[PDB]
Design a protein around this ligand. Structure first.
Ligand code: CA
Ligand code: CA
Ligand code: CA
Ligand code: CA
Ligand code: MN
Ligand code: MN
Ligand code: MN
Ligand code: MN
Lengths: 232, 232, 232, 232
């Protein structure tokens, strides 16, 4: 199966699969059952920023999510990503809706990888083109006329649909480690719009890094954030 | 056929196809017969730096080549690259040897594309990995144990072979223009090592931008820098 | 006196000092009488973006100004900035109001300088702190509680005042050229808000580069954009 | 007194002031007595690279030092730099020689600061100009004709002198934190040449961040790395 390292903005507490009992952000290391989590004060309808960062000396993966005039949620986990992930990866964004739903809109996505022996890859998407040839679009993910990436299905009045799933990987494989490396790092930012007619929107959004040929595993919908085939 | 925009470091004057009568750098716009050229004082055996730059307001494509303690060669041509190239391109490096030869070694390759409506792609290769999955290697181009990209054939004592050709494109398509754009730019740097047992080394090296599915055209060897099927 | 190279967003046609008879953008080379200009469709009240760029091989200084859903204004002038400016400079933003007025609000300011022999300086101000120790504030320029730089005077209901002038230079001197250089470039972006209760707002805004100890020259108010002591 | 956060490449074990009994790298938090250290296999005469990095979510300051074909030394310390340093700082490089000596040559210095509410400052010095107006040179630090910064005294045959001290701060104050910040980070790289006719060279080199008006404290020579007035 795929190897997944992901940072989840889980809008729906699925307490049956070990989620805390509130909307949380979390760090997922080969399982949907976050290695660590923090409580997230979700402001649905408001534009949120997420930042993710990691270097291989500190070996502490950390994320932060905020909105204008809101306090932030931060989470960190100590892990060495070379003991988890292959040397070549594809990075991407995943989202799902389930029986309950939301718009999983991405307004901007930026990413930096650095590998010293300095090699680097950077990309910055501030408006997603109508045909983004440097993206791999998986499942229901599309771009739209406002230059937004819609990870999960919406209808043409911008109403979100349920039981949906989608992802966007950067086209190019990213080299995040090698034998002779001295130090690797990456950073990642996306802005996002989560809108929902539901009291409790679902299911969330992730930034994620994976084996290069990653794909939406069978059965990974709703709570599994198009990421895992099961909640082990 | 492919659409080529290229910056040539032509080590061999092929005066039969309109090259000036000396080693030159040149700007090629859909033909090997440079739109403009300048004389290049080649120092074979020495590490050279080339820089290429362009923005769509100035609409002046310009390049500069130097070595330590050498004077530089600069060349520029006025052209609008949106009237020449498609909106999505692949960027790359090409080189050939012919009846006469050289090592076409690339020690570093870096590239920045910017598209304002800001979108950007950056990459920086300072040591080319043994299996560069973010490169498309075409013809005889390979990487080697020093972390160099060898565009054209060498033997294991580093001796160059003749009648050779190779290219390296960045894996990801680059978005260099769109309908609604305000301004696009790109920059490009490579360092290179040209070594030759011959009095007059051949044939040269280019940085080049092309239609996304570009490939070494039939018959493009030696003087045609793996770029064009003919010298029209 | 100071040596000024500036890019003007001149909201007020001062036809008595050679301005075209409409709102224009222009490139100023040691004089307020732009070396070249283009017509600018000003949308007062709307957030505008300006981009400026230059490299010393092309030797073409160019600028572009746009707003969302507006067409852009572009201008370029061929000049070698090493034959004009010293090797060490301070870069900054200037604005004035005169008998007629506007808010000269800067929402973001970013700048990149590159000097190859690669040396570089970058800065990016997206919200201007309440006490910006890396800025030199000249004349009436201040920052405000929204994290905006107000180049020219406003009152606390955001109403602009007339006969005003201000500038913001980056604290650090920027090295834009040297003897042994192969190639220098710079880029600059600011976003701005021009609001006015007047039919014809005045006087404008500039990005500018100058001798390191530059200061608001005596008499440089209104139409002289806090830049020149006279309109020669 | 100054507030110092520093990363030391301590070439001389001063076991009388709590240094481990070998050449070490270390993280100094308001004292020369490193909060944490690691053993450093010094290769005097060889060009070394040091990298330093930090973000305020992970709150783990970490450094790595290597040379070509050498294994690396890495060190990390958990600390929140907002509970230690002011909001505005100057960053710099310090070095000393003592009764024993070395050349403290810096071939390149690069630095990135990022502050999200994104503000950023970057600089990259690959050859230090003969008169670096964007540097504050303190004590014996000068630049030289090879475009190297010599932190500590050398004579004109490149022989190092003893009992010396010098520093180089970036001219501009750096904004590394504020009240409303979501996340701050910085990164820093320098390359260095330590040469010595002595069996046991002294005293070392640091990258350091400090109150904005920092200066070489009285008595801070040799083992105190021009950083602290005493070894408390
Ligand atoms: Ca969940
Ligand atoms: Ca030729
Ligand atoms: Ca005017
Ligand atoms: Ca010591
Ligand atoms: Mn969860
Ligand atoms: Mn030619
Ligand atoms: Mn004018
Ligand atoms: Mn020590």
């Amino acid at each position: 199966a795929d190897t997944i390292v992901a940072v989840e903005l889980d809008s729906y507490p699925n307490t049956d699969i070990g989620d805390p009992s509130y909307p949380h952000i979390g760090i997922d290391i080969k399982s949907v059952r976050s290695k660590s989590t923090a409580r997230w004060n979700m402001q649905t309808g408001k534009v949120g920023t997420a930042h993710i960062s990691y270097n291989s000396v500190a070996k502490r993966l950390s994320a932060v999510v905020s909105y204008t005039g809101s306090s932030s949620t931060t989470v960190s986990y100590d892990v060495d990503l070379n003991n988890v992930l292959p040397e070549w990866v594809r990075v991407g964004l995943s989202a799902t809706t389930g029986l309950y739903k939301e718009t999983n809109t991405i307004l901007s996505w930026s990413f930096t990888s650095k590998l010293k022996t300095a090699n680097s890859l950077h990309f910055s998407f501030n408006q997603f083109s109508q045909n983004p040839k440097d993206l791999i679009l998986q499942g229901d993910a599309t771009t739209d006329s406002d230059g937004n990436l819609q990870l999960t299905r919406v209808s043409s009045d911008g109403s979100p649909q349920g039981s949906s799933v989608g992802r966007a990987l950067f086209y190019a494989p990213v080299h995040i480690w090698e034998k002779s490396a001295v130090v690797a790092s990456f950073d990642a930012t996306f802005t996002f719009l989560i809108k929902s007619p539901d009291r409790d929107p679902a299911d969330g959004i992730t930034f994620f890094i994976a084996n290069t040929d990653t794909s939406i595993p069978s059965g990974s919908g709703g709570r599994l954030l198009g990421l895992f085939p099961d909640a082990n």
